[PDB]
Write a protein that binds this DNA or RNA. Structure first.
Ligand SMILES: [Mg+2]
Ligand SMILES: [Mg+2]
Ligand SMILES: [Zn+2]
Ligand SMILES: [Zn+2]
Ligand SMILES: [Zn+2]
Lengths: 94, 257, 214, 215, 192, 91, 151, 133, 95
RNA sequence: UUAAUAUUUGUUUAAUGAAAAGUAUUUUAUUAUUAUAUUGUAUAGUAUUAUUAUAGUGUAUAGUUUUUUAAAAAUAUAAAAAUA
RNA sequence: AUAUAUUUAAUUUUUAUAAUUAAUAAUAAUUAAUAUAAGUACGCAAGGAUUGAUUAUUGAAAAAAGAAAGAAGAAUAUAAUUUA
């Protein structure tokens, strides 16, 4: 369920040339409870200076994402939500 | 992956089916819960009868459901009948659920807390043995003369399993709108709940005064000044309630016990 | 409220029971899901005149009370009207909102105590005296029994201060014993029925009766 | 914008249940392989599905007598036949054919190949008949064919006329249909689980583990 | 024509904005929006006299001087204030200037209030306030004495309360004894 | 909405729907402190009963007075004397 | 789950492979976890005094018929089939947790715990040692400044 | 545009009609809540007399010296009595052209409702809400 | 503001208190600087396969001689710590 | 002819005294108190039963009770994303 | 700023079924990044072409033979998910 999935760190390895990209980003939302071809997953990954909001679809052989926390961490979800909101409002040019 | 040939939620025709393509579409609110459905011309929504605004439409729906729960039936016109039937089904669902949240939601929706209580008292035991479609809608062959709109008689199904309205005959209305409704000869000895009986007696005794006769004659005068035809003169009008008529109606009420 | 799902197994509350509520047995392996436990909604208890007067009578008996032993005192009270600790907490919250009692914290034992407000202490005393007179009028006894009770009351009044305190302790412990004994023979059934007031709000009307169990 | 989840969506200081066995994808794949190669629990093979033209509300009162008479029909000791849940076939106005919820017909193409149509509905409420679990599929299908033949003879006798268990089932119980369900082939063997091929030795290991767990 | 009015589920603020009825505890802002000849809202009754005068006099003699905003903030900082607004403070100060109680002198860029005309009477009022504080301390000592008396009265209340508890528990005891005698009198005869 | 008694100042909260917009200003409700029928006035504003279209359940939300009134009667410093008797989360 | 009207081997395998996604589900967990177990179904089961997946699986076909055609539980058959399908591995989880333990082991559990605590202590020891070196360098700078002032 | 809140929140300091309540010009008891014939002027002060606002009768809210109405609906308290500004400043008695022995004032603090104490009252009350404790 | 903003401000205040308790890192002295230089040179000549040892020594000399003398003392200490990290982590991947 | 037209369409009331103006058949309009002849009390205007609260006092919770219709274009208002 | 006439775009509501012909929307003088022919041909040499491929620019189109006064939903996307 949402309350137990959102907020979990996700390790995503994307097979891209010339070197696969390795990211770690918390779950922000899920589109399906059980497994499905339209499962969907919303992940916020922040690098050293880059913040991105990825929507990884399930079943792609090149986009291998694994959930590792095994738990929800709703407070961590809230913290990451606030971080993304502040970064998104800041990034606009003024 | 690519996008559909028509991207975004595009309003289709009234009788066009679903598309079943990936489209980011949001609902206004959770319409799956009773009495929270949306009105529209698609198939997932109730047929929106004509109203000045969605607020006015919801007010009309609330008064419709209130009168429906009050007198067990309602004669409506046009697209109001499917909405009334579906909302009556929703009310029966809430009554059978019988949660405190269901009580509070039906109280938020209805105009009468006494009708909320009457529903939650009668409808569970009345429709315990029914799965769905608790209300029946019958299209009448007579139309409203003013706007030629199609009329529909909407009612509840389990008439005999109900505490109130047990044995009531709706083939013809009562003699007066404040008198108790007709009763078949077979169910003459039936008895009504005392609280509903007292409420009806109070509301009916409201109309037994002379100030109501004055309101009646003044309404005659108003509708005659407003150009409405076939409205007699307040000199030719006669009161709806008199002493001998009340006496014989009391005799008939004691006969029906 | 069931013994297994809402409380750990083995515990039971010595108080008034709800009418027609079955005390069904729950298996020992029963456990709630972490997500299912969040969406649990309890029915509202009665914070009305009878429960608040009962709790005020207990708080007037024990001057002052402590929140830990308050449930024990309520269980020892003969005419208990509370359903469980949740009902007790709700009645305490209602009394706090109405201003009958206040909650202080002792800096010595680091525990919360429930004191009676000075402005409402007179009304609490009036309620306690009216309840005592009602219990006296309802209690039935013969001439000799009434004479013996009056003599015992006169003796307890003529006794000293510490003598009266020890007599009160003995009397309350014997009352606790006789209540634990009589509970096996009769209980207090609480019945409820929801309704809606003129403001569209849902509230319950409650009845309290006593029924013999054999 | 608005986030779909508010702050009060999860109470603070409360933990949620874990949604996977371990964070390691290898351990996840191994546990998935175990649960995929596990034997199909709760799966039973009915000898015959018996159906009537009445409704479940009318057959519930007679379901026990149907069990006893089916035991007498199988000529088995009392208590060897178990009736599954009553399935009320969908009352359909258009009657699509082949659906599991479609009402059965008193005719089949193999029975009347040269018939230009089918015969009207014969069953509207069905129930499976299960034997003991230790019995083999050969005995199951033998008992099914025996019951089918006996019920067909009883229906023919009833049609020709207007103490035997079949006659009682057809007259008193109102039973008017019996079929032999085809074997369910939905569960396909997992050649690979999680992309890793399942070797014969590993499959035998999982089978032995599940046998020891059942023992 | 308003979206908030056309929305099917009206908010509480939206329903408040429809409170144009001239009534007790109605939408005062929505009733003031309409003209004065339409809404029956008279002028604001501002209480003037010695009650706000002495208060602002003490609060100004404490600092001597302060600006208008500083005076308003220092007054609002307290709990009991006969002044409802800075405009009320301004009117009180203006009446005091007319009666020669406070005088406003303009500095390089601001105005400050001082007590120069009634400086002797201002010191007299300050000494009266100090004597009132001393009388409040004496009343606090008398309240400590009355608290000792109330401790005696509370000991008497504890005596009568324990007597009431005894007479109640004895009643509950005899009631339970009667019930147990009705059900199974063996336990009652054993307890005597 | 949040209402207070005219005689004693007792406060209780209850959301107002579209069927009771006439009773939003003044409510004739039974007061538990006065033990009789008293007039209740509108004090502070809650969010709403229904849902704003395409807006979450939080929108609009109660005012700062309603949030402060709740926090004084139920919160950290308010439920602490009540968490020792029952701990409402449990029975 | 739709089931198209009847539970099949594919649906049973679906439930079996999804049993991995619920390690904390025991045979004694509440009945609301089973598929197609609505509020009406759950309330009717609680009336029947059925608070457990074990008690759902231990039901009889006649009881299921009573619940489906006289109480109003439409997917009671689906709930009962799900319970009967998943009850057998739940007993194993409860008695020993075989599928959960034989794949990790207490040895690996304690190894992971010890390595976690050692790494967490090393992370703080790194900062402790770097602060010690910083303080030592500050003292050396003080000594060098004293020597330069003496010079 | 009006620049004042509506429905002043009294959660910090409730303004209720006291059980005992006398007048300022009359020192006689008034009706508490049954009739709004009195005039309530609240300011949130316990300053004597009649704390949390004094009270006046509609007929008696007039000046006590000249027995006339008020100019701008503003009275002057003078040793326990309510005078008018021309009376307090020492000017001559001026007879008003409008109503003589009664002033334009609403009933039950309706005219003094748009100004006074609102929410929040103090600064330490907002930080009580925004802090978790 | 809100409760979450207040908690965030309190956490930031605690972190700032800890950071103020911690001192500015280091201004390295000549002795330990030469020790680190010798360690770097010896580690390069021990494990430097394909990279020119002469070019590596020239780069290290250029760093130690111009970069620290150009930058500030805090950056000098940061460079000292980074050089120690390189010595302990095999020149940071210089193969 | 336009004209099978445009337009109308009566399902829910938050407010309190004159005079100009209006004379509409007030059948005894009122039923009485006081005192003292006589005289007169219900309805505007903008060609109308019309965008309409005539602002002379005065204050107020009486809810002080006539707005059809089952999809569309164009137009008219109101809202209108994590694009700029 | 007007549909009055002409002219257009549609429609005259399951027609089991486009296509014998009328008429009718897409007849390369493309542009930019790469890579290959090739580091070729051709140049004294430095140099260095032509050139069919992928992207880039994101769309797809069939006219006339059947019974007609409700909502082409018995409406809360099921051709009745149990139903008194
Ligand atoms: Mg006119
Ligand atoms: Mg046709
Ligand atoms: Zn009150
Ligand atoms: Zn007065
Ligand atoms: Zn004056």
């Amino acid at each position: 369920t949402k309350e137990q999935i959102l907020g979990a760190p996700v390790t995503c390895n994307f097979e891209y040339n010339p070197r696969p990209v390795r990211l770690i980003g918390t779950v922000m939302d899920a589109h399906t409870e059980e497994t499905s071809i339209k499962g969907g997953l919303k992940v916020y990954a922040r690098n050293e200076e880059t913040n991105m909001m990825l929507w990884i679809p399930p079943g792609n052989p090149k986009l291998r994402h694994e959930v590792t926390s095994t738990k929800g961490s709703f407070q961590h979800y809230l913290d990451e939500r606030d971080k993304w909101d502040e970064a998104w409002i800041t990034g606009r040019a003024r | 992956g690519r996008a559909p040939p028509v991207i975004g939620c595009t309003r289709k025709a009234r009788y066009a089916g679903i598309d079943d393509n990936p489209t980011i579409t949001y609902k206004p609110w959770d319409t799956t819960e009773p009495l929270m459905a949306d009105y529209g011309w698609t198939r997932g929504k109730l047929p929106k009868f004509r109203a000045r605004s969605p607020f006015h439409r919801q007010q009309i729906a609330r008064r419709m459901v209130t009168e429906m729960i009050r007198k067990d039936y309602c004669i409506v016109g046009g697209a109001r009948a499917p909405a009334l039937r579906i909302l009556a089904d929703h009310v029966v669902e809430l009554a059978k659920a019988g949660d405190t949240d269901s009580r509070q939601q039906l109280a938020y929706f209805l105009h009468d807390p006494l009708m909320v209580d009457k529903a939650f008292d009668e409808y569970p035991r009345r429709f315990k043995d029914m799965n769905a479609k608790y209300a029946m809608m019958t299209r009448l062959k007579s139309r409203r003369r003013t706007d030629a709109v199609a009329m529909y008689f909407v009612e509840y199904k389990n008439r005999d399993m109900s505490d109130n309205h047990k044995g009531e005959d709706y083939s013809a209305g009562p003699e007066r709108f404040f008198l108790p409704p007709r009763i078949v000869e077979t169910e003459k000895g039936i008895q009504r709940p005392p609280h509903m009986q007292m409420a009806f007696d109070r509301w009916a005794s409201k109309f037994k005064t002379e100030e109501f006769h004055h309101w009646w004659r003044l309404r005659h005068a108003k509708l005659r000044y407003w150009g409405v035809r076939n409205v007699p003169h307040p000199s030719d009008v006669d009161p709806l309630w008199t002493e001998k008529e009340e006496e014989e109606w009391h005799n008939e009420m004691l006969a029906n016990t | 409220w069931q013994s297994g799902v809402h409380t750990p197994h083995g515990v039971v509350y010595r108080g008034a029971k709800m009418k027609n509520w079955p005390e069904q047995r729950i298996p020992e392996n029963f456990k709630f899901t972490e997500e299912q436990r969040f969406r649990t909604k309890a029915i509202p208890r009665d914070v009305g005149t009878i429960p608040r007067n009962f709790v005020l009578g207990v708080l007037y008996r024990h001057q002052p009370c402590e929140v830990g032993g308050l449930w024990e005192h309520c269980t020892n009270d003969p005419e208990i009207v509370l359903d469980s600790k949740r009902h007790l907490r709700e009645v305490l919250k209602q009394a706090r909102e109405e201003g009958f009692v206040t909650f202080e914290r002792d800096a010595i034992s680091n525990e919360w105590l429930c004191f009676l407000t000075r402005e409402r202490y007179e009304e609490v005393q009036r309620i306690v005296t009216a309840k005592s007179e009602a219990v006296d009028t309802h209690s039935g006894l013969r001439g000799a029994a009434a004479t013996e009770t009056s003599t015992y009351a006169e003796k307890f009044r003529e006794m000293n201060v510490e003598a009266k305190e020890a007599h009160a302790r003995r009397l309350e412990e014997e009352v606790a014993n006789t209540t634990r004994y009589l509970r096996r023979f009769q209980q207090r059934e609480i019945d409820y029925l929801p309704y809606t007031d003129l403001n569209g709000k849902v509230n319950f009307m409650w009845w309290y009766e006593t029924r013999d169990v054999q | 914008y608005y986030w779909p989840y508010n702050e009060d969506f999860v109470p603070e200081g409360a933990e949620t249940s874990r949604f996977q066995s371990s964070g390691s994808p290898g351990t996840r794949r191994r546990v998935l392989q175990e649960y995929a190669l596990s034997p199909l629990f709760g799966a039973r093979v009915p000898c015959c599905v018996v159906g009537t033209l009445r409704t479940a509300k009318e057959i519930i009162v007679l379901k026990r007598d149907i069990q006893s008479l089916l035991c007498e029909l199988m000529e088995l000791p009392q208590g060897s036949v178990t009736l599954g849940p009553l399935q009320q076939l969908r009352e359909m106005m258009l009657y699509r054919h082949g659906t599991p919820l479609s009402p059965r017909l008193g005719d089949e193409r193999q029975l009347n190949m040269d018939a230009y149509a089918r015969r009207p509905i014969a069953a509207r409420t069905m129930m499976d008949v299960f034997l003991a679990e230790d019995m083999s599929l050969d005995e199951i299908v033998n008992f099914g064919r025996l019951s089918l033949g006996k019920l067909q003879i009883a229906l023919n006798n009833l049609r020709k006329e207007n103490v035997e268990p079949a006659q009682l089932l057809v007259d008193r119980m109102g039973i008017s249909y019996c079929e032999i369900p085809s074997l369910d082939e939905s569960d396909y063997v997992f050649a690979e689980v999680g992309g890793v091929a399942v070797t014969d030795e590993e499959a035998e290991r999982v089978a032995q583990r599940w046998a020891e767990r059942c023992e | 024509k308003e979206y908030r009015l056309t929305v099917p589920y009206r908010s509480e603020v939206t329903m408040l904005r429809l409170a144009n009825h001239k009534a007790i505890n109605s939408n005062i802002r929505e009733l003031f929006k309409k003209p004065l000849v339409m809404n029956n809202i008279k002028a604001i009754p501002r209480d003037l006299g010695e009650i706000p005068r002495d208060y602002v006099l003490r609060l100004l003699f404490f600092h001597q001087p302060i600006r208008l905003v500083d005076l308003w903030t220092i007054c609002k900082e307290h709990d009991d204030v006969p002044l409802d607004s800075a405009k009320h403070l301004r009117l009180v100060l203006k009446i005091a200037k007319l009666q020669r109680w406070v005088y406003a002198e303009k500095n390089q860029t601001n105005n400050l209030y001082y007590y120069y005309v009634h400086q002797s009477r201002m010191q007299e009022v300050q000494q009266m306030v100090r004597a009132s504080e001393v009388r409040k301390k004496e009343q606090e000592s008398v309240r400590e004495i009355e608290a000792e008396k109330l401790r005696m009265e509370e000991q008497e209340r504890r005596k009568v309360a324990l007597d009431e508890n005894i007479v109640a528990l004895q009643n509950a005891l005899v009631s339970n004894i009667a019930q147990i005698q009705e059900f199974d009198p063996g336990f009652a005869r054993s307890k005597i | 909405a949040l209402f207070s008694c005219f005689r004693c100042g007792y406060m209780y909260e209850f959301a107002v729907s579209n069927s009771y917009c006439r009773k939003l200003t003044l409510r004739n409700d039974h007061c538990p402190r006065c033990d009789q029928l008293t007039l209740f006035r509108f004090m502070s504003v809650s969010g709403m009963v229904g849902n704003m279209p395409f807006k979450p359940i939080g929108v609009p939300g109660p005012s700062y007075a309603t949030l402060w009134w709740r926090k004084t009667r139920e919160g950290k410093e308010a439920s602490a004397p009540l968490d020792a008797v029952c701990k409402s989360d449990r029975w | 789950i739709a089931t198209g009207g009847r539970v099949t081997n594919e649906d049973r395998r679906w439930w079996l492979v999804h049993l991995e996604c619920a390690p904390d589900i025991t045979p004694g967990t509440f009945i609301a976890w089973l598929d197609c177990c609505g509020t009406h179904t759950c309330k009717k089961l609680i009336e029947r005094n059925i608070w457990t997946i074990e008690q759902v699986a231990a039901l009889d076909s006649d009881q299921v018929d009573e619940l489906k055609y006289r109480e109003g539980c439409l997917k009671m058959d689906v709930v009962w089939e799900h319970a009967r399908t998943i009850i057998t591995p739940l007993r194993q989880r409860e008695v020993t947790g075989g599928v959960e333990s034989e794949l990790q082991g207490r040895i690996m559990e304690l190894r992971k715990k010890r390595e976690l605590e050692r790494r967490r202590e090393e992370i703080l020891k790194e900062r402790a040692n770097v602060s010690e070196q910083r303080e030592e360098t500050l003292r050396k700078l003080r000594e060098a400044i004293a020597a330069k002032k003496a010079a | 545009r009006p620049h004042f809140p509506a429905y002043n929140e009294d959660v910090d300091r409730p303004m209720v009609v006291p059980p005992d309540a006398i007048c300022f010009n009359c020192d006689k008891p008034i009706d508490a809540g049954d009739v709004n014939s009195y005039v309530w002027i609240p300011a949130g002060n316990a300053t004597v007399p009649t704390p949390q606002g004094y009270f006046f009768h509609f007929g008696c809210f007039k000046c006590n010296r000249c027995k006339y109405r008020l100019g701008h609906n503003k009275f002057y308290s003078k040793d326990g009595k309510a005078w008018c500004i021309p009376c307090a400043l020492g000017r001559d008695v001026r007879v008003p052209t409008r109503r003589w022995h009664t002033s334009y004032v609403n009933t039950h603090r309706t005219g003094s409702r748009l100004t006074g104490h609102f929410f929040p009252r103090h600064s330490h009350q907002m930080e009580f809400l925004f802090d978790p404790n | 503001d809100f409760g979450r903003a207040a908690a965030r401000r309190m956490q930031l205040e605690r972190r700032r208190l800890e950071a103020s308790t911690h001192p500015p890192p280091v201004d390295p002295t000549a002795q330990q600087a030469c020790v680190l230089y010798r360690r770097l040179l010896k580690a390069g000549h021990q494990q430097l396969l394909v990279t020119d040892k002469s070019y590596y020594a020239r780069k290290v000399r250029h760093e130690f001689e111009v970069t620290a003398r150009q930058t500030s003392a805090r950056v000098r200490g940061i460079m000292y710590e980074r050089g120690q990290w390189l010595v302990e982590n095999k020149l940071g991947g210089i193969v």
